[PDB]
């Protein structure tokens, strides 16, 4: 009676494998395990959300409130959390907006299922309850859109899209950060009377170059690109040359050599005297045809030899390394030229135009300015950030990346429209799901009623992070929808929130319709997987 039988299955599989199955654990146990990371995201939600410091094993510190970025650098042993982590990764890759909503909504769907399983409701009927409730949710989101806009052009129309996204991240800056993104989008879009057929837009058109030092208000928008390099051979001519042709060469500038390793073979000394001047006049012939075409700038991705740099310095031709290939195609879009691997001679149709180039120090380090005024740019821009700390500017770059991601999600489909924010949409969905359960009798009513309860976390998080009571302001919000003016009721964050009612159209805080549709589908599927896994199989280490 001292020792246990050890079970016969101990010899089966291995000792490193661990098993969690129905009645063996999990079943609202593992749901209580993700509540630690769920509470982590609850404090980071909203404009009052709290950033979180994460130190990776490498030592790099990433401070942000984005759930997709935080869960990426964290090593998590619990497997079912990765279902929620990978759910937030899809939100950042495709839409790029709503990562915090997916983790919070999917976490509450597992919390409201705690009462369902405790009542004896099998997980088979729970999956059918959320699937039928998700289809009814997506169908009711179209009738609530008052923000349908056909423009997507004027800068003031972006104040209802880009600005509300920036309001949450780095709430300390509103008009400063919104002007940087709105001006960068106006530059990358082509100027035309009517542009149809869904003009192409990508996240690579707007870039962020972070420079240490300086206030955020001192930041500006540059149509070109700002890279940190060392110019060589001469000082720029400023505007004396006006528009100058820029030739981008993929291959380096040097006498063409074979891929195989060659060497010089000299039979007699007669070829030795001509070997010195031979390499000089050979490369000079290809460099002379470039100066005849009026090319003041040459960009060669690979390393340029000193023999090629000697000739280009006297003619006043700029040389820029650009080691990275990814940034090489970005300078080509500024001037609008064609990258040429061959040397040959520059053709007029394949050469671009740059208004001016200058070398200045924004933060004390010399950088080259590609800014082009009056010129024609296509899908290119940059945003120079000025900040005292490097970690604070890290989330600002992600806030800009999330701001331009909304433009990509707005432009690519027919449209993203708008939705009322600040807890206005989440409360309206509660009355829709609640009444939907009473229309169809059955055992699924328990899963439908609890599906609407999980929508209460979003509007109260704005009140919880504002230092407000969720038993007063939140219950008084439902009475404001009693009945247009009843759809615009929302959560107020202010010392004046005691009334609990602030008009949303005053500050114009709106959310994308396509973002909420993609966030609910991922959050519902993520919570469905946790409830659909009956047995867990682990491994050693």
């Amino acid at each position: 009676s001292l020792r246990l039988p050890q079970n016969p299955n101990a010899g089966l599989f291995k000792q490193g494998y661990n098993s969690y199955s129905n009645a063996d654990g999990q079943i609202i146990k593992s749901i209580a395990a993700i509540r630690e990371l769920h509470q982590m995201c609850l404090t980071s939600m909203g404009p009052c959300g709290r950033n979180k410091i994460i130190v990776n094993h490498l030592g790099k510190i990433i401070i942000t409130n984005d759930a997709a970025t935080m869960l990426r650098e964290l090593d998590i042993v619990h497997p079912a959390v990765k279902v929620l982590v990978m759910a937030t990764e899809q939100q950042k890759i495709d839409m790029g907006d709503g990562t915090n909503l997916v983790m919070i909504l999917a976490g509450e769907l597992l919390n409201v299922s705690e009462k369902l399983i405790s009542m004896g409701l099998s997980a088979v009927e729970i999956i059918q309850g959320y699937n039928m409730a998700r289809k009814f949710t997506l169908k009711e989101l179209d009738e609530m859109v008052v923000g349908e806009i056909t423009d997507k052009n004027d800068k003031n129309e972006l104040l209802k899209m880009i600005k509300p996204v920036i309001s949450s991240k780095k709430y300390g800056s509103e008009d400063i950060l919104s002007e940087l993104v709105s001006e960068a989008v106006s530059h990358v879009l082509p100027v035309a009377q009517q542009a149809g057929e869904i003009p192409y837009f990508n996240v690579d058109s707007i870039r962020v170059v972070k420079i240490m030092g300086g206030s955020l208000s001192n930041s500006t928008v540059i149509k070109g690109m700002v890279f940190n390099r060392e110019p060589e051979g001469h000082v720029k001519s400023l505007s004396e040359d006006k528009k100058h042709k820029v030739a981008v060469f993929t291959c380096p500038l040097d006498i063409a050599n074979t891929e195989t390793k060659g060497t010089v073979l000299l039979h007699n000394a007669q070829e030795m005297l001509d070997f010195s001047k031979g390499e000089e006049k050979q490369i000079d012939a290809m460099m002379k045809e470039i100066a005849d075409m009026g090319v003041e700038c040459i960009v060669a991705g690979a390393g340029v030899g000193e023999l090629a740099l000697h000739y280009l310095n006297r003619y006043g031709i700029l040389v820029l390394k650009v080691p990275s290939k990814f940034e090489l195609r970005r300078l080509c879009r500024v001037c609008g030229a064609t990258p040429l691997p061959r040397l040959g001679a520059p053709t007029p149709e394949e050469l671009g135009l740059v208004e001016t180039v200058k070398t200045m120090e924004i933060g004390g380090d010399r950088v080259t300015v590609f800014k082009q005024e009056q010129g024609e740019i296509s899908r290119t821009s940059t945003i120079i950030l000025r900040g005292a700390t490097q970690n604070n500017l890290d989330d600002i770059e992600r806030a800009i990346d999330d701001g331009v991601a909304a433009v990509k999600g707005l432009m690519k489909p027919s449209g993203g429209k708008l939705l009322p924010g600040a807890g206005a949409t989440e409360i309206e969905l509660i009355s829709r799901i609640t009444k939907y359960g009473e229309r169809t009798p059955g055992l699924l009513q328990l899963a439908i009623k609890q599906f609407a309860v999980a929508f209460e976390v979003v509007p109260r998080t704005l009140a919880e992070t504002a230092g407000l009571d969720v038993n007063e302001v939140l219950p008084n919000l439902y009475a404001a929808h009693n009945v247009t003016d009843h759809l615009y009721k929302g959560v107020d964050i202010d010392g004046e929130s005691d009334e609990g009612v602030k008009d949303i159209r005053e500050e114009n805080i709106y959310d994308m319709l396509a973002t909420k549709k993609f966030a609910i589908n991922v959050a519902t599927e993520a919570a469905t997987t946790v409830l659909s896994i009956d047995q867990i199989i682990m491994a050693k280490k």
Partner: protein
């Protein structure tokens, strides 16, 4: 959820705990599977101290060998308590509990709840009690048949030993229980029969003695070894150095007083010796032919042994406490504590008193009593384990025969009781029984588990257990329509059936009644246990 309550704990529940009771009881039954039956295997136990235990009893195997599995601990405590009261049924309960768990485990895998399975065990067991009244055969003790006690005693003897030691020990056990039966009808098993281990000759030379034998003998040479007529005087008072009460002591003024005070130690000893001499003055008639002996419960001072030597009085010291209670049954006298009041009536009588000195130890033999009320059994063996093998074989045969004289009924053996319940439980209408629906299944698991014991007997004989029971069921089919009531047994010699009444195979009534009742409660509590955990402060 136990890992949150305790940092380190071990637990197994549901299917993990269901394999605990089924598998652990399967390995324990397999050890005693080859034990059951007269042809069963013989096991020897050797511990780290060097002792040797050689016996076929399943109780010695459980007590000597430790068991780590907690499931078998419940079975070991149940099999041990079965041999305590009934002297039999140790290996029977183990085969019942271990098999009933496996027979009920097949339906647990089918989705049947354990409670409704255990509920059918009680319904099926209560019918075995109602059938037990018609199954038992009444025996009247007024006939005083000696042949009946011979066949019943051989049931336990043929199992433990072969026919060589059975023929020797059969009349010994019968002659022992013959004096147990009295007009009072009260049967006292402990005082009537004892087991005394002595190594002499061979184990097959064991003989029966009609009077008490003691482990002590005369220390002084002049003490008569053989006394024709001896009067046994029971003395529970000890003559020897006493505790002296904190040892106050003597103080002498002169050297003449030193030896004068030393004689006071013999003043108290000789005071009680004069009473024995005065008692001898009454029996002094025919002193050369007769004799006077003294048996003391406690050690006697060697200073006083020379007093009994001059009077030719045999003295016995350091006797056992239980032996003092039997001196009234053997000799016929009474016990005497204080020597102040002495009478010839309390003196016993013996026709032969002799001592046999073997080695350093000396033993005193008493026999030839007028109306002896008790007897003894002298166990002889070649080796230390041979003394224990006969001790466990005779003692288990004592309770078997003693339980026969308690009641008026006797149960036939040879698996006739287990086969009869199979046809009874399977052919009984369920409307008469209180079990319905799924509870009908639990009764079938109890009836099938009872057929393994008659099959286990055949496994030791080498014959196929399935083919030998085919002829048993075919005989009971035509016996009901032929107006003939006959019990069918199992004969392992020829591999055919037999009749326990003609062959002489009988089993005690209290053994099978307490075995089924005991085995049912063990297996029921194990099937109703869905979790096994270990927690405690150490």
């Amino acid at each position: 959820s136990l890992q949150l309550l305790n940092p380190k704990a071990e637990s197994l529940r549901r299917d993990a705990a269901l394999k605990v009771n089924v598998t652990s009881a399967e390995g324990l039954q397999s050890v005693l599977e080859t034990n059951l039956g007269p042809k069963g295997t013989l096991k020897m136990l050797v511990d780290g101290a060097g002792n040797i235990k050689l016996t076929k009893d399943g109780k010695v195997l459980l007590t000597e060998m430790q068991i780590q599995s907690p499931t078998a601990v419940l079975i070991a405590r149940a099999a041990a308590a079965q041999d305590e009261i009934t002297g039999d049924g140790t290996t029977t309960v183990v085969c019942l509990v271990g098999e009933l768990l496996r027979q009920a485990h097949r339906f647990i895998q089918e989705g049947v709840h354990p409670r409704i399975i255990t509920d059918g065990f009680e319904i099926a067991r209560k019918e075995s009690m109602k059938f037990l009244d018609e199954f038992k055969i009444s025996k009247t003790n007024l006939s005083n048949d000696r042949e009946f006690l011979l066949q019943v005693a051989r049931s336990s003897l043929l199992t433990k030993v072969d026919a060589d030691l059975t023929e020797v020990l059969t009349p010994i056990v019968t002659d022992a229980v013959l004096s147990v039966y009295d007009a009072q009808a009260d049967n006292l098993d402990l005082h009537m029969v004892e087991i005394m281990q002595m190594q002499h000759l061979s184990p097959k030379d064991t003989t029966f003695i009609k009077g008490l034998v003691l482990d002590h003998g005369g220390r002084h040479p002049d003490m008569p070894t053989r006394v024709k007529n001896a009067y046994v005087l029971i003395l529970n008072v000890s003559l020897e150095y006493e505790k002296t009460e904190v040892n106050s002591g003597f103080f002498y003024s002169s050297a003449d007083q030193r030896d004068k005070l030393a004689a006071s130690e013999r003043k108290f000893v000789d005071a009680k010796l004069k009473k024995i001499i005065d008692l001898k003055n009454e029996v002094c008639g025919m002193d050369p032919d007769k004799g006077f002996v003294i048996i003391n419960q406690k050690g006697i001072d060697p200073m006083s042994l020379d007093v009994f030597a001059k009077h030719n009085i045999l003295a016995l010291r350091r006797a056992k406490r239980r032996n003092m209670e039997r001196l009234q049954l053997v000799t016929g006298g009474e016990a005497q504590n204080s020597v102040e009041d002495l009478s010839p009536q309390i003196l016993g009588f013996s026709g032969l008193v002799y001592q046999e000195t073997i080695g350093e130890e000396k033993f005193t033999y008493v026999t030839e009593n007028t109306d002896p009320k008790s007897c003894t059994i002298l166990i002889k063996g070649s080796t230390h384990y041979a003394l224990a093998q006969t001790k466990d074989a005779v003692r288990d045969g004592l309770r078997a025969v003693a339980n026969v004289l308690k009641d008026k009924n006797i149960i036939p053996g040879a698996g006739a009781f287990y086969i009869a319940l199979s046809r009874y439980l399977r052919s009984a209408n369920m409307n008469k029984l209180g079990a319905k629906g799924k509870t009908k299944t639990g009764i079938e698991a109890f009836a099938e588990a009872l057929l393994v014991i008659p099959k286990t007997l055949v496994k030791n004989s080498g014959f196929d257990p399935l083919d030998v029971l085919a002829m048993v069921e075919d005989e009971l089919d035509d016996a009901q329509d032929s107006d003939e009531t006959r019990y069918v047994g199992v004969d392992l010699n020829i591999g055919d059936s037999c009749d326990p009444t003609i062959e002489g195979i009988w089993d005690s009534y209290r053994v099978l009644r307490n075995a089924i009742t005991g085995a049912t409660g063990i297996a029921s509590n194990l099937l109703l246990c869905d979790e096994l955990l270990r927690a405690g402060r150490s």
